């Protein structure tokens, strides 16, 4: 029932604009949203592939926050809070 085509547009334009404002951008161009969605999709694809590999190595079928944190640390982004 879900639309694979209605997922890149899931990150709404006001959401990306609010993210750019929280970062430090005042005026956002038009083609910025598509590039941001593409970069986010590529990053999510890589992280999800790493998590799937970790879950297949752990002989499980559920992606856990511990595996997500391990994949993020292996990529080079140590995240705190969620996990330990």
């Amino acid at each position: 029932r879900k639309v694979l085509r209605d997922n890149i547009q899931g990150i709404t334009k006001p959401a990306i604009r609010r993210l750019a404002r929280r970062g430090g951008v005042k005026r956002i161009s038009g083609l910025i949203y598509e590039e941001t969605r593409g970069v986010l999709k590529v990053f999510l694809e890589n992280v999800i592939r790493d998590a799937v590999t970790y879950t297949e190595h752990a002989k499980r079928k559920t992606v856990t926050a511990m595996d997500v944190v391990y994949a993020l640390k292996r990529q080079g982004r140590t995240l705190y809070g969620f996990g330990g």
Binding site: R22, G23, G76, R77, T78, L79, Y80, G81, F82
Partner: peptide, 28 residues
Amino acid sequence: PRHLQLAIRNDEELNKLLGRVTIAQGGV
């Protein structure tokens, strides 16, 4: 965690040590 991120970004030594560390549930 917002106060923790404030302290990390305020302390130059802490920012140099935990450079690739992102504190969840906090702003910049």
